[PDB]
Amino acid sequence: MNVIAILNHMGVYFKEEPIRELHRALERLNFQIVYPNDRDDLLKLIENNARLCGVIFDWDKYNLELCEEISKMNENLPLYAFANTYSTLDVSLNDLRLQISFFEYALGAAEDIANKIKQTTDEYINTILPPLTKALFKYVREGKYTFCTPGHMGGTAFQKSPVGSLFYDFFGPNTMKSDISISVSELGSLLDHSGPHKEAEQYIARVFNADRSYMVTNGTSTANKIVGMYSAPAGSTILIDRNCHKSLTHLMMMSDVTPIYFRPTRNAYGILGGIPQSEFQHATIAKRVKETPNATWPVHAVITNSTYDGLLYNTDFIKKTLDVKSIHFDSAWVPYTNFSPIYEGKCGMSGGRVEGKVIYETQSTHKLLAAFSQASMIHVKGDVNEETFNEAYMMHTTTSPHYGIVASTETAAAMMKGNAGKRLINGSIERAIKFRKEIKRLRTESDGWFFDVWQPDHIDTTECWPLRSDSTWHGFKNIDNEHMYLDPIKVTLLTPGMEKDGTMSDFGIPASIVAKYLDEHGIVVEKTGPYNLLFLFSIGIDKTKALSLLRALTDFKRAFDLNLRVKNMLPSLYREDPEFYENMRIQELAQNIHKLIVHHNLPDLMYRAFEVLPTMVMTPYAAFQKELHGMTEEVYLDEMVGRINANMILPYPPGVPLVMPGEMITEESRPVLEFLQMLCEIGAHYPGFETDIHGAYRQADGRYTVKVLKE
Amino acid sequence: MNVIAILNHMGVYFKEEPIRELHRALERLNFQIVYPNDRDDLLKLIENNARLCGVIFDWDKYNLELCEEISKMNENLPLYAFANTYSTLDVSLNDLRLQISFFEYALGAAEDIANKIKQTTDEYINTILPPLTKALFKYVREGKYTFCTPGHMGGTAFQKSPVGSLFYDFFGPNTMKSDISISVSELGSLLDHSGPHKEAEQYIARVFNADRSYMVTNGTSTANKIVGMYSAPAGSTILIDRNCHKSLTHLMMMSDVTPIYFRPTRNAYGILGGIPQSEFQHATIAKRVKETPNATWPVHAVITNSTYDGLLYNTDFIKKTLDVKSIHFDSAWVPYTNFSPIYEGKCGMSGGRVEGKVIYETQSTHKLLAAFSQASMIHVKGDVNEETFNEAYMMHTTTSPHYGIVASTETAAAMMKGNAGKRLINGSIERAIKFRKEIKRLRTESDGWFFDVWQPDHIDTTECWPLRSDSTWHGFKNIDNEHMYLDPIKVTLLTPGMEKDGTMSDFGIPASIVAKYLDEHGIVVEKTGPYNLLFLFSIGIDKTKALSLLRALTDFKRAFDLNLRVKNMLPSLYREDPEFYENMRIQELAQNIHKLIVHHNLPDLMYRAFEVLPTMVMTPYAAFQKELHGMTEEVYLDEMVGRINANMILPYPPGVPLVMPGEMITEESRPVLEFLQMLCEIGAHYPGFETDIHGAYRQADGRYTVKVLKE
Amino acid sequence: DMEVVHISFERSALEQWLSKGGEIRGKLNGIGFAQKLNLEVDSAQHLVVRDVSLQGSTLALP
Ligand SMILES: *Cc1c(COP(=O)(O)O)cnc(C)c1O
Ligand SMILES: *Cc1c(COP(=O)(O)O)cnc(C)c1O
């Protein structure tokens, strides 16, 4: 932060001479001087250059063309405008947040002007930064306390060992001095939630529109366990969603509760839909209470909003129909549904305080923002118990937290306030819609097959596309209107291979082959499997990473139409088995895999293995108690009908659990077992495309074995 | 002072080559070289740049466009014009004060030209400076007289102590070397009135239009006590104004005199008017002599012109109607009513010597000018005894005056002499009138409430607006025409909240909240309280300090219309009581205070309290005699009817005295006691706006105590 | 618009206002309906009852 801009040239000498004298004075305090051209030149030095804090221009030249565009991008940006004798303000400059610093054209006083700019810049740093981060940066340059934890003490022990000097010189002197425990009085303690930590939690809740936001120092996987132990005593009933995460599985195995699983919707490509509105009714929930032994009235509900793919729900209908006093919204993928007008009334924070209820949100911080790992937030909107949830937080958080993660967790909330933060959410949406239009433009004009985006036929508007009932792009049988929305930044690429009715085709290329080609250039695919893709276009994805993805997609069509070799295209796949992948081309491998999907019939077995839920015998908590006592055995995959599994089956593809730890596969869940045996045959002929199922151990013959419970 | 200007590039080589040779010669003697462009470029290098002393231009190019505009600014400014063979003067260049130094275009003679410029520059320094300041600067570089006072002797003792080096290195070496006393022979003594001090007193009185003037080195508060003890024997009668100063009250407590208080005019906003023309009559003054026990013919009259708000009177009517041989004018706020044609006949110095009378004025020097603190003057206009008035001046001035303030006291009289000083007095008026028009322009065009300037509806002139009897902006009933004047550089912002008839309204914001909002940016209101905002637009307020005030006023309307919080607007007020000022906004605090003013009825309990006067039992000099003997006691505020106070009550707001030391509250001054009890209730509910009365001590219960005398 | 010397509150309604918040309803002089009052918390752990004139009154138990 040391860029000073000097716009325009009046051509006279009594105004340019103070500029030349100030040019030699600002360089003595480490400041970069730039000379923009016209009005459009200064506008490009703010959006692309964020390290700018000084704008020098003539007040009697552009008093309305600069005080309006800059105010739409930053509010606290200092404006070192130079006024004259006959200078005044404008009536259209009253409702604009600006910081104008007036000066004169006096000779010899250039040294006093440089001291005022440095002090004004210091005031800008101490204002935009939160009091927790500001106190951490000031403690390094002044606070030098001894006999404290940890033992390194700002990197002192590393300066006495040859191996320690290499680890200290990698980061920096300011990095080790910022890692302090609760051994500091002027910064407070995180466990006590007082002093600087008290105002830090209230600052994030005001930015993200919440009551009292929290700062988890262990990650999102831990925040879901602390909240889950609140509205679930030793013997209750919760309404957990079927599309759960690995962290949510351990929550049901550590609490003696009776969960009730829902039945979300889905199509044939593998895109996870949502829970219908019929499941949120009062007669539907009460019907499953009597059918499930040892289950009372549900006191907690877990809703995954949004899912792993990227489909939001309608909170305006759930907060009125779902009669649950503790509704959870796992917002681990949408940390931005607030700073945009096309995201109003879609999450738990948008709206008023629902009486008699409470909203929980575990928004991931180190996923689609900018902070260190093991960071999360807890958004509470309602009335909770004071002497209950406090004990649940200390059971998973150490007494000496790492303030380096806390300083970055609150920083992401500070990067959203103002026009400088609002352009990050809207900027990623404009780059996403532009990328969606480039696919349809390069599809008709091209000569042959081309990728397709799972989007409606009309993407001219700039909002969330609703999933209506008179459309054919979503492919969901009987979907509720005004309930399922589309995420613009979550671009879902559909590879040609299936039809619009849910069947197969002769010419098709699986998405697993394209995912291996993108990894060669450095593009990591988030979700892949049958005939679908997924990418993350958050605020950190600039225009370079967006345009580089389309170039990698156009190169796949050129290498496939010309019929090239695998060795001259996929060097990583060739090193796995050079003997088998010798005389094989790119067209021979793409056609042999496509015939295996039609032969084994993947879309039909996958769609029927997820709707029919297996019979849950006991609670997931009782299944873990038998494992510690030594009552587990390993059986074959073909010999398990009528047994209780011990682990959770997570086949890739897709990415949702199959059998919960504690269920039994009987005659009703027959297609469920057929889905596991089908992946073992299709993923065993060609190297590199092996079967990936979390829970199935590979032996020495090919048959996978699972861990079940003894009878 | 080392700026040399070179105007007009002829394009030829025989004229530009001597310029290049002179460029390398003037830099050897520390001189800055500038190159203006056109004719308007040189004009901007004089008004804004005051460190210029050399103008080089072609005489045969602009002989009439430069010798006229420069002469209107600085007369003794050297002009290094270069003439040619066929060069001559003009008939219109005879009545102009200029200093033109001709030269030639000779090669190799650039060294001799540089010696002539340095010698001419030294002549300009030895001319614009007074002989007292010239002897002070010469004694620093050449005076080496040892064994003198003070003991530091230019900072010798500071170089031997570790703590003394920090105090000496802050100001500078030349700062302590000028701190000399009367231990110098070539500078004389101030008490002796000889040598350089004798010519200094005649130089100040000649510029300020006076016969004899001194240099008070203890502020204006001390100069008022020296004059008051010159024409007021023990047991006489003085005519002191009611709107007096803290120092004017102590003058009545140091001399056994019988004062007679006047009845100044006032409105409802708190702005005090002036003394009516009926009080200066002969039948009005003589009537109060018989009613007041122990009172003879008044021999001295103290008139506060102008007051604290800045309202000039009419000296053309007082010097003929008021029959006082010693009329005093407290000119502590107008040290400039002479250097402008819109101030003729408004002070005591303007005009001539009154036959049989004498005029005394205490023009402040450090108030609204440019000099060190504790500096005042005594302007004497008449025939007084020199051997008698000299002994009274030594009663409050030490024998070793501080020449650092004396040099700046005479400097203010030299900075205003000539056309160079008239551009600062008239320049501050033009900047004040321009600021007055920017308020009315941003009031009608705005959408909502806006600040108002206490000025007439027609301000399309550059003079003192008279307070007529057919106007409603001033709100002074029974006002005398051609007696009340307005100071253009005294802009009084009237915050909305009251009507034009003197009653109250429904929507308004008090001036106490705005006073603290301006403090965050570095703006302190001179006078605030009810619904007024007084500011000082003297010579120290340039175009930067004037335009910075308008921007802060527009930010208050934006923050109030959007309804912001107190913590996110007033951080200084939030630190006083974070618990009470937690869930409070800017609109909730502005409306609760406005209802307390209407409920307690402030304009009525303040106008009627200042109108009536308590019964003065004894003289103020007799009240101080009983305090030294120990006959004082502290009583409650509610129990004091019929007692004699010991100190002067100065409640804030406003800023004028209430009860003089030596008065008694009977049944006539009933509203006077009600004004003190009303401020104790309104200033206790909300923190920050506590009751400020210089005389009321705060206890541990809330009730204030006063200091009275024993019965 | 009437004087009062004792105010009675309900135990089943006092625990809800001091935990969840909102507004409290209490009758006057043991008669009438549970009218709404301007009851707040004190810095010295008391119960300040506010009226139409912004006056404070610390409650106490017999
Ligand atoms: C990725 C993810 C997590 C894990 O996030 P971490 O902060 O790395 O622990 C937890 N829950 C869901 C729904 C996730 O998608
Ligand atoms: C400010 C003031 C004074 C005090 O001025 P100093 O130079 O500081 O002594 C005295 N009289 C009046 C009327 C003042 O306004």
UniProtKB/Swiss-Prot annotation, chains A, B:
GO terms for biological process: arginine catabolic process. It catalyses: L-lysine + H(+) = cadaverine + CO2. Homodecamer. Interacts with RavA. Disulfide bonds: none annotated. PROSITE patterns: OKR_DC_1 (PS00703). Pfam families: OKR_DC_1, OKR_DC_1_C, OKR_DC_1_N. It comes from Escherichia coli O157:H7. Its EC number is 4.1.1.18. The modification N6-(pyridoxal phosphate)lysine is found at K367. The keyword Cytoplasm applies. InterPro entries: OKR_de-COase_N, Orn/lys/arg_de-COase, Orn/Lys/Arg_deCO2ase_major_dom, Prn/Lys/Arg_de-COase_C, Prn/Lys/Arg_de-COase_C_sf, PyrdxlP-dep_Trfase, PyrdxlP-dep_Trfase_major, PyrdxlP-dep_Trfase_small. It is an enzyme of class 4 (lyase). Keywords: Cytoplasm, Decarboxylase, Lyase, Pyridoxal phosphate. The lineage of its organism: Bacteria, Pseudomonadati, Pseudomonadota, Gammaproteobacteria, Enterobacterales. It is found in: Cytoplasm. Its main location: cytoplasm. Its cofactor is pyridoxal 5'-phosphate. GO terms for cellular component: cytosol. GO terms for molecular function: arginine decarboxylase activity; lysine decarboxylase activity; pyridoxal phosphate binding. Belongs to the Orn/Lys/Arg decarboxylase class-I family. This is Inducible lysine decarboxylase.
